[PDB]
Design a protein around this ligand. Structure first.
Ligand SMILES: Cc1ccccc1C
Ligand SMILES: [Cl-]
Length: 162
């Protein structure tokens, strides 16, 4: 297992514009297009991202390239952020994947509310961090996804994905 396989399981793959759990236009392996309610705005963002007139549909190769870019961007966001980088660097490779997963789903700004969880993770207080992570809108709105990610932080294994 690696971060790409983990996120492919959590996000799925769809080659036509769809709506995510919050109702936002998305395509591919969880690539957010726009938060605007306008399908035309989403189609424009898609064409800009792919570099051709897609009319709302992409190929598997295009979805996989967008996905590589999106994972890269999540990692770079962590490494540039003075609050997140020290916690990330303290983690083992499996737990680092759980961290990237959260940033991919919620962004840097969405993880800003997790300051207390981050401190517990940096201190390697895994059970305590798991409880704190679950006291969140994230866990209540996407509980199965959150349980898999939290279990990865708690155990440092891939057991939730196996
Ligand atoms: C979201 C995030 C980022 C970096 C380290 C740990 C965590 C939970
Ligand atoms: Cl879920």
């Amino acid at each position: 297992m690696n971060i790409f396989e983990m996120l492919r399981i959590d996000e799925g793959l769809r080659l036509k514009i769809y709506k995510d759990t919050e109702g936002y236009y998305t395509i591919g392996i969880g690539h957010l297009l726009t938060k605007s309610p306008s399908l035309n705005a989403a189609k424009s963002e898609l064409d800009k991202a792919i570099g051709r007139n897609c009319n709302g549909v992409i190929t598997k190769d295009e979805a996989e390239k967008l996905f590589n870019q999106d994972v890269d961007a999540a990692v770079r966001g962590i490494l540039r952020n003075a609050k997140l980088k020290p916690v990330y660097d303290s983690l083992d490779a499996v737990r680092r994947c759980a961290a990237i997963n959260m940033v991919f789903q919620m962004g840097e700004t969405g993880v800003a509310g997790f300051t207390n969880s981050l401190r517990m993770l940096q201190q390697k207080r895994w059970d305590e961090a798991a409880v704190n992570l679950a006291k969140s809108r994230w866990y209540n709105q996407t509980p199965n996804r959150a349980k898999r990610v939290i279990t990865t932080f708690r155990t440092g294994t891939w057991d939730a994905y196996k």
